[PDB]
Design an enzyme around this catalytic site. Sequence first.
Site, PDB file in Angstrom:
ATOM      1  N   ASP A 170     -39.500  96.674  52.201  1.00  0.00           N
ATOM      2  CA  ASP A 170     -39.627  98.100  51.903  1.00  0.00           C
ATOM      3  C   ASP A 170     -40.972  98.446  51.266  1.00  0.00           C
ATOM      4  OD1 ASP A 170     -39.283  97.763  48.923  1.00  0.00           O
ATOM      5  OD2 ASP A 170     -37.245  97.200  49.504  1.00  0.00           O
ATOM      6  N   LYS A 174     -48.506  91.493  46.017  1.00  0.00           N
ATOM      7  CA  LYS A 174     -47.203  92.155  45.994  1.00  0.00           C
ATOM      8  C   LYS A 174     -46.046  91.200  46.312  1.00  0.00           C
ATOM      9  CE  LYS A 174     -48.004  96.334  48.202  1.00  0.00           C
ATOM     10  NZ  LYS A 174     -47.965  97.553  47.348  1.00  0.00           N
ATOM     11  N   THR A 175     -46.321  90.176  47.128  1.00  0.00           N
ATOM     12  CA  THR A 175     -45.360  89.103  47.415  1.00  0.00           C
ATOM     13  C   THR A 175     -45.160  88.188  46.197  1.00  0.00           C
ATOM     14  OG1 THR A 175     -46.038  89.173  49.747  1.00  0.00           O
ATOM     15  CG2 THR A 175     -44.674  87.313  49.084  1.00  0.00           C
ATOM     16  N   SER A 180     -49.596  92.917  55.081  1.00  0.00           N
ATOM     17  CA  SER A 180     -51.056  92.878  55.189  1.00  0.00           C
ATOM     18  C   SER A 180     -51.586  91.498  55.584  1.00  0.00           C
ATOM     19  CB  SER A 180     -51.712  93.350  53.881  1.00  0.00           C
ATOM     20  OG  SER A 180     -51.357  92.515  52.787  1.00  0.00           O
ATOM     21  N   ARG A 226     -53.771  43.522  89.275  1.00  0.00           N
ATOM     22  CA  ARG A 226     -54.178  42.116  89.355  1.00  0.00           C
ATOM     23  C   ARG A 226     -53.172  41.161  88.709  1.00  0.00           C
ATOM     24  NH1 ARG A 226     -59.698  42.502  90.545  1.00  0.00           N
ATOM     25  NH2 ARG A 226     -59.853  40.224  90.283  1.00  0.00           N
ATOM     26  N   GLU A 246     -63.336  52.092  67.339  1.00  0.00           N
ATOM     27  CA  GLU A 246     -63.914  51.549  68.561  1.00  0.00           C
ATOM     28  C   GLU A 246     -65.089  52.384  69.066  1.00  0.00           C
ATOM     29  OE1 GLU A 246     -62.276  52.181  72.404  1.00  0.00           O
ATOM     30  OE2 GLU A 246     -62.193  50.046  72.907  1.00  0.00           O
ATOM     31  N   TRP A 253     -58.567  44.826  71.562  1.00  0.00           N
ATOM     32  CA  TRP A 253     -59.377  43.906  72.359  1.00  0.00           C
ATOM     33  C   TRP A 253     -58.975  42.433  72.233  1.00  0.00           C
ATOM     34  CZ3 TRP A 253     -62.802  44.695  76.211  1.00  0.00           C
ATOM     35  CH2 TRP A 253     -63.340  45.985  76.370  1.00  0.00           C
ATOM     36  N   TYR A 288     -69.648  47.773  77.768  1.00  0.00           N
ATOM     37  CA  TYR A 288     -69.681  49.106  77.179  1.00  0.00           C
ATOM     38  C   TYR A 288     -70.942  49.309  76.345  1.00  0.00           C
ATOM     39  CZ  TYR A 288     -64.772  49.436  78.550  1.00  0.00           C
ATOM     40  OH  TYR A 288     -63.596  49.466  79.265  1.00  0.00           O
ATOM     41  N   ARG A 312     -63.081  55.383  86.160  1.00  0.00           N
ATOM     42  CA  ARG A 312     -62.685  54.841  87.469  1.00  0.00           C
ATOM     43  C   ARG A 312     -61.196  54.524  87.567  1.00  0.00           C
ATOM     44  NH1 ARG A 312     -61.481  49.522  87.042  1.00  0.00           N
ATOM     45  NH2 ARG A 312     -62.268  48.464  85.158  1.00  0.00           N
ATOM     46  N   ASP A 319     -55.175  54.839  83.087  1.00  0.00           N
ATOM     47  CA  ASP A 319     -53.792  54.644  82.689  1.00  0.00           C
ATOM     48  C   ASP A 319     -53.325  55.888  81.939  1.00  0.00           C
ATOM     49  OD1 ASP A 319     -51.282  53.259  81.992  1.00  0.00           O
ATOM     50  OD2 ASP A 319     -52.141  53.139  79.992  1.00  0.00           O
TER      51      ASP A 319
HETATM   52  N1  LIG Z   1     -39.354  89.343  55.296  1.00  0.00           N
HETATM   53  C1  LIG Z   1     -40.160  88.388  54.832  1.00  0.00           C
HETATM   54  O1  LIG Z   1     -40.056  87.062  55.297  1.00  0.00           O
HETATM   55  C2  LIG Z   1     -41.197  88.708  53.794  1.00  0.00           C
HETATM   56  C3  LIG Z   1     -42.070  87.594  53.260  1.00  0.00           C
HETATM   57  C4  LIG Z   1     -43.054  88.077  52.232  1.00  0.00           C
HETATM   58  C5  LIG Z   1     -43.122  89.410  51.842  1.00  0.00           C
HETATM   59  N2  LIG Z   1     -42.284  90.351  52.378  1.00  0.00           N
HETATM   60  C6  LIG Z   1     -42.317  91.747  51.908  1.00  0.00           C
HETATM   61  O2  LIG Z   1     -43.537  92.389  52.223  1.00  0.00           O
HETATM   62  C7  LIG Z   1     -43.733  93.480  51.333  1.00  0.00           C
HETATM   63  C8  LIG Z   1     -45.149  93.493  50.769  1.00  0.00           C
HETATM   64  O3  LIG Z   1     -46.076  93.487  51.831  1.00  0.00           O
HETATM   65  P1  LIG Z   1     -47.483  94.270  51.725  1.00  0.00           P
HETATM   66  O4  LIG Z   1     -48.290  93.953  52.925  1.00  0.00           O
HETATM   67  O5  LIG Z   1     -47.232  95.682  51.361  1.00  0.00           O
HETATM   68  O6  LIG Z   1     -48.176  93.577  50.454  1.00  0.00           O
HETATM   69  P2  LIG Z   1     -48.610  92.033  50.448  1.00  0.00           P
HETATM   70  O7  LIG Z   1     -49.108  91.605  51.773  1.00  0.00           O
HETATM   71  O8  LIG Z   1     -47.493  91.195  49.974  1.00  0.00           O
HETATM   72  O9  LIG Z   1     -49.801  92.010  49.374  1.00  0.00           O
HETATM   73  C9  LIG Z   1     -50.930  92.830  49.562  1.00  0.00           C
HETATM   74  C10 LIG Z   1     -51.880  92.580  48.408  1.00  0.00           C
HETATM   75  O10 LIG Z   1     -52.589  91.368  48.591  1.00  0.00           O
HETATM   76  C11 LIG Z   1     -53.948  91.528  48.222  1.00  0.00           C
HETATM   77  N3  LIG Z   1     -54.818  91.471  49.416  1.00  0.00           N
HETATM   78  C12 LIG Z   1     -54.405  91.356  50.721  1.00  0.00           C
HETATM   79  N4  LIG Z   1     -55.495  91.358  51.523  1.00  0.00           N
HETATM   80  C13 LIG Z   1     -56.601  91.476  50.756  1.00  0.00           C
HETATM   81  C14 LIG Z   1     -57.957  91.531  51.067  1.00  0.00           C
HETATM   82  N5  LIG Z   1     -58.346  91.643  52.335  1.00  0.00           N
HETATM   83  N6  LIG Z   1     -58.886  91.655  50.045  1.00  0.00           N
HETATM   84  C15 LIG Z   1     -58.463  91.728  48.727  1.00  0.00           C
HETATM   85  N7  LIG Z   1     -57.113  91.673  48.429  1.00  0.00           N
HETATM   86  C16 LIG Z   1     -56.194  91.548  49.426  1.00  0.00           C
HETATM   87  C17 LIG Z   1     -54.068  92.918  47.607  1.00  0.00           C
HETATM   88  O11 LIG Z   1     -53.838  92.767  46.224  1.00  0.00           O
HETATM   89  P3  LIG Z   1     -54.326  93.813  45.102  1.00  0.00           P
HETATM   90  O12 LIG Z   1     -53.431  95.029  45.102  1.00  0.00           O
HETATM   91  O13 LIG Z   1     -54.223  93.125  43.766  1.00  0.00           O
HETATM   92  O14 LIG Z   1     -55.760  94.216  45.360  1.00  0.00           O
HETATM   93  C18 LIG Z   1     -52.932  93.667  48.271  1.00  0.00           C
HETATM   94  O15 LIG Z   1     -52.457  94.760  47.519  1.00  0.00           O
HETATM   95  C19 LIG Z   1     -42.700  93.324  50.226  1.00  0.00           C
HETATM   96  O16 LIG Z   1     -41.651  94.232  50.474  1.00  0.00           O
HETATM   97  C20 LIG Z   1     -42.208  91.905  50.399  1.00  0.00           C
HETATM   98  O17 LIG Z   1     -40.895  91.730  49.922  1.00  0.00           O
HETATM   99  C21 LIG Z   1     -41.353  90.015  53.326  1.00  0.00           C
HETATM  100  O1  LIG Z   2     -60.531  52.674  78.478  1.00  0.00           O
HETATM  101  C1  LIG Z   2     -59.630  52.289  79.218  1.00  0.00           C
HETATM  102  C2  LIG Z   2     -59.535  50.944  79.558  1.00  0.00           C
HETATM  103  C3  LIG Z   2     -58.510  50.523  80.400  1.00  0.00           C
HETATM  104  N1  LIG Z   2     -57.596  51.420  80.901  1.00  0.00           N
HETATM  105  C4  LIG Z   2     -56.509  50.920  81.779  1.00  0.00           C
HETATM  106  C5  LIG Z   2     -56.549  51.507  83.186  1.00  0.00           C
HETATM  107  C6  LIG Z   2     -56.152  50.346  84.070  1.00  0.00           C
HETATM  108  O2  LIG Z   2     -54.768  50.407  84.315  1.00  0.00           O
HETATM  109  C7  LIG Z   2     -56.472  49.099  83.266  1.00  0.00           C
HETATM  110  C8  LIG Z   2     -57.782  48.461  83.724  1.00  0.00           C
HETATM  111  O3  LIG Z   2     -57.532  47.586  84.799  1.00  0.00           O
HETATM  112  P1  LIG Z   2     -58.643  47.369  85.940  1.00  0.00           P
HETATM  113  O4  LIG Z   2     -58.034  46.536  87.046  1.00  0.00           O
HETATM  114  O5  LIG Z   2     -59.833  46.688  85.368  1.00  0.00           O
HETATM  115  O6  LIG Z   2     -59.042  48.721  86.484  1.00  0.00           O
HETATM  116  O7  LIG Z   2     -56.578  49.507  81.915  1.00  0.00           O
HETATM  117  C9  LIG Z   2     -57.689  52.769  80.552  1.00  0.00           C
HETATM  118  O8  LIG Z   2     -56.883  53.600  80.980  1.00  0.00           O
HETATM  119  N2  LIG Z   2     -58.708  53.193  79.710  1.00  0.00           N
END
Ligand SMILES: NC(=O)c1ccc[n+]([C@@H]2O[C@H](COP(=O)([O-])OP(=O)(O)OC[C@H]3O[C@@H](n4cnc5c(N)ncnc54)[C@H](OP(=O)(O)O)[C@@H]3O)[C@@H](O)[C@H]2O)c1
Ligand SMILES: O=c1ccn([C@H]2C[C@H](O)[C@@H](COP(=O)(O)O)O2)c(=O)[nH]1
Lengths: 514, 492
Positions: free
Chosen positions: A36, A78-79, A157, A256, A294, A316, A342, A422, A425
């Site tokens: 809310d 706010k969270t 936010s 082989r 390696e 190896w 290599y 070449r 695997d």
């Molecule tokens: N349903 C859920 O799983 C869930 C989970 C978490 C929250 N919520 C709900 O979400 C609601 C709050 O959400 P909201 O978005 O209004 O507030 P918010 O995201 O929780 O917090 C916003 C605050 O974070 C700070 N902030 C964010 N971005 C900023 C930025 N770019 N630069 C500087 N400060 C920054 C600011 O703090 P300042 O005011 O100090 O500057 C801003 O007021 C609540 O009702 C809460 O219960 C729900």
């Molecule tokens: O770097 C590597 C080295 C070997 N392999 C695998 C691929 C091939 O099945 C064998 C090499 O057998 P050969 O008969 O030498 O081609 O090992 C790979 O996938 N990557």
Amino acid sequence: SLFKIRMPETVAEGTRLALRAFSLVVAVDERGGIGDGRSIPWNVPEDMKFFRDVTTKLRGKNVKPSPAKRNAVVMGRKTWDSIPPKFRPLPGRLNVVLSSTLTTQHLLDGLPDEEKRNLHADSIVAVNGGLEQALQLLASPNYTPSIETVYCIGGGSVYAEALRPPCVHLLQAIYRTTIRASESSCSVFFRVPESGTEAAAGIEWQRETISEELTSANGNETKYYFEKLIPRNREEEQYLSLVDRIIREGNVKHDRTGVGTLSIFGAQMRFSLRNNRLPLLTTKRVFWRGVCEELLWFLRGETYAKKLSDKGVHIWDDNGSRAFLDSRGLTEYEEMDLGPVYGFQWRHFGAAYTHHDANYDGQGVDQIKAIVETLKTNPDDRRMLFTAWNPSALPRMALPPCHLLAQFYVSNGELSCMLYQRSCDMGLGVPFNIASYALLTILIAKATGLRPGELVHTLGDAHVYSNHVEPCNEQLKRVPRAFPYLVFRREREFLEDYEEGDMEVIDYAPYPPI
Amino acid sequence: MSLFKIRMPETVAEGTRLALRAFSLVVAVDERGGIWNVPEDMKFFRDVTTKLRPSPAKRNAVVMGRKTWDSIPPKFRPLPGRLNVVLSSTLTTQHLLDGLKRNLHADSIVAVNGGLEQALQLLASPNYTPSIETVYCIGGGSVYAEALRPPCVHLLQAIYRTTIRVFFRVPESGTEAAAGIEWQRETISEELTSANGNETKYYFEKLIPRNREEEQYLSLVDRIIREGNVKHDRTGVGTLSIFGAQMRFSLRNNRLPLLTTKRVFWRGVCEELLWFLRGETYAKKLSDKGVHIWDDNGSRAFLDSRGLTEYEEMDLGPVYGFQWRHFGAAYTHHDANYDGQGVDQIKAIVETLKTNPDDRRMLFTAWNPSALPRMALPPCHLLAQFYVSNGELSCMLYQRSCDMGLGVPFNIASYALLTILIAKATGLRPGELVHTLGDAHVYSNHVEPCNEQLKRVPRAFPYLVFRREREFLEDYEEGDMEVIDYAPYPPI
Ligand SMILES: NC(=O)c1ccc[n+]([C@@H]2O[C@H](COP(=O)([O-])OP(=O)(O)OC[C@H]3O[C@@H](n4cnc5c(N)ncnc54)[C@H](OP(=O)(O)O)[C@@H]3O)[C@@H](O)[C@H]2O)c1
Ligand SMILES: O=c1ccn([C@H]2C[C@H](O)[C@@H](COP(=O)(O)O)O2)c(=O)[nH]1
Ligand SMILES: NC(=O)c1ccc[n+]([C@@H]2O[C@H](COP(=O)([O-])OP(=O)(O)OC[C@H]3O[C@@H](n4cnc5c(N)ncnc54)[C@H](OP(=O)(O)O)[C@@H]3O)[C@@H](O)[C@H]2O)c1
Ligand SMILES: O=c1ccn([C@H]2C[C@H](O)[C@@H](COP(=O)(O)O)O2)c(=O)[nH]1
């Protein structure tokens, strides 16, 4: 040092995260109203429980929220005021409040007593701006990657800011509870924009899950249901539709060993690398640490696989064993010496390889350094490519290169890369290679003063192994999720100096093992 | 007296109020896209921004940042024949005028304390809409940056870029930065040579946002010509046709799907639709307004050719709108009183929409087999169904027979209007028009012109704004609404 690639003064620029990815939690009535302007005009304790759990719980198993690792929750002033002073701050989570009125001290001053202020000091932060400003702050080293998942909860936010660019592009998931009531008391509204609308900004929202209609034990028998909405991932869908095509129309082949395969020939895929995005597949987890370790190993021109296994990367091991090397005639290589494979060709093309112990600095053609220099001076050159396919060196390699060629292109200050592979695997190798060439392109972007653009992946023999058919087919049921991001915690003076620990993959939420 | 009419709710203007006005962008860049005396570029800049398709009642607006205003050499400012809109947090319209000559240019400059969005809000107001034909953004880096991102980018109809040989960047298609917009060239010129020192090389580009909705129509016209079956009718008139198609058109945010590749007679569309809604049958009410679409089917000769011998000229019988408002009523003549007679399908739909949005029976028909022999012409657009989602009203039209060249673009507009008006009557915002086609055809005589029209790249659609409101739906007049930023291609 003279042989290494020196990173430019703009290393962290064009790779730095502008905004952190986030998910959104909201409850609505059927008219789309939320409150809310001050409070919420319904009471469903079951939804309050879901809100608690989804925002509180970490990913995985036996988790415990902590100052070092926890979720963050971003709300409007706010969270904040709507939460009863005893119930605030939200426990087990970092509370990020948006306000121009109140400071961080003001928010603590609104707490009942000093004990509560001293205890919850580390768990409350005020941002003087909007959600964008909060995502900028949560993108800071202090919070990234300490915060696993950010959740917007924030009210009309903030919700409105979340559902509009630039913020909506970082929105990974909407968790929406609908209360079956038509509340006239609502003044604040919430709506997700539809597939092809201007307000959707190219995003196609779809539901991963919807619950059955449920009945609240609130005394009013109020009906309600849950929904998880995700942004359609068409890039991963490419890979899934190819898998499906291989199952349905692929030819039966045998490798082989006599191991059966379903295969097609000739495919192409594309992946955005823009603004930190990393195409790690979500329908099945990718071994990122292996990918990363390696790739760095490739980039260094390394040939000793023991450097990987010592780091717990055993990809190896089988190809480096005595038995395997011997079977290729490589009887003179010590174990784990793979030969000039290599990245040796990348940095030392055509160099005479004997053992890994030798010093190959300035030997062969350094294709990668050649590419870096070209990119910073004449980015429109059409010869910016490197190859590991060296027929002269092939017989002395443990394995001939699979991903064998890559080409670079520049438009609008963005670096794009085309990989040629070449043998592909699909089950295990392809997702690994996509991640691998994504990393490469990102690193070359950083080395050259460019922003990452797009990865293009060309596949030759794309195939699904016999024993992967059934798993892969079950994987097709999964709706792809949003991709993760790549973030650098630190930089280096030289490209070759980069470590796996210098970077972090964030907001990777893949599906569980099949 | 008005008991049989449809009363609008208190929320009439809310769902169709213009938030932001549409605009075009003009820029000159170097070869790297960055940000020098090319006279041909100056003449182009003047011609594009000044010319109408000019008076204090009919002119173009130019929106600029404060420093761009500063960089115009005094006496060239204000830019002649255009409203000059200067964005400034420091300078008021009095301040800008003080820098100048004065007096007579008071009606030519306005300062906006805010960005482009705020300036577009102002120009959207009745004072400047539709008195201002085209808005041009010419402002500096910061203004351009705001123009190429949401919300403003969604109102950008065209980008005129001169490349001459802060970075100006148009987002590539499929990019997140593009926000679902696909930018493409309507035109690119040859590399031209300036008349000056240095023999400067330069070229013009006109970039437009791809209109995929109008492409549906053109893609269908193309398929009909290339693959359509050949028919010759009862008079021996040749046609190419396909059977069964469907198109969708967004009506959100004041959007009006008036086709741009070939001009649509909007005024006729609007007068006729209102005439339908009123339940009218006397086509002389239209011809007395300069709408002559029904003349050839209202003449004594044609009426007699249908054996409608007792109808006086221009009385079409219980056609269309008569069925909408009086389904199954006995028809005698147009001047008879039909209040309360037959089934009022429109009023029933309006009441259902407000009380039970999810109803699946919210449709009306003009296809009345009992009344067909008494109609001058059997209904072509014969069924419409309504649908509500996310506070939005959608509509599906069924059309049995579809002349692609002339009829179809008219009927898209007609039912676009209908849906907008019903949303206003029901407390909803316009959503989507869905258009189902039966026998979709192109006449033999239209093949060549239609084929040439296919070469034309569709432009962004216009907007419909309501200048005033009414107490009853039937009271709406064509003068109550205006189409803005409609820039169709010239005659075929
Ligand atoms: N349903 C859920 O799983 C869930 C989970 C978490 C929250 N919520 C709900 O979400 C609601 C709050 O959400 P909201 O978005 O209004 O507030 P918010 O995201 O929780 O917090 C916003 C605050 O974070 C700070 N902030 C964010 N971005 C900023 C930025 N770019 N630069 C500087 N400060 C920054 C600011 O703090 P300042 O005011 O100090 O500057 C801003 O007021 C609540 O009702 C809460 O219960 C729900
Ligand atoms: O770097 C590597 C080295 C070997 N392999 C695998 C691929 C091939 O099945 C064998 C090499 O057998 P050969 O008969 O030498 O081609 O090992 C790979 O996938 N990557
Ligand atoms: N090559 C071309 O086609 C082209 C076209 C235009 C301009 N330019 C050049 O670029 C130069 C200026 O470019 P610029 O990047 O500085 O942009 P600009 O056109 O000067 O716009 C910036 C100024 O506009 C006002 N403004 C912009 N956004 C505002 C907002 N959100 N709220 C309140 N005021 C706002 C501010 O004025 P206040 O400081 O008074 O508050 C601000 O200083 C000019 O000298 C011109 O030569 C080139
Ligand atoms: O609203 C209209 C009314 C008629 N037409 C066209 C379609 C047909 O070619 C003629 C009507 O001839 P008929 O034989 O009744 O189908 O006019 C249209 O496209 N849209």
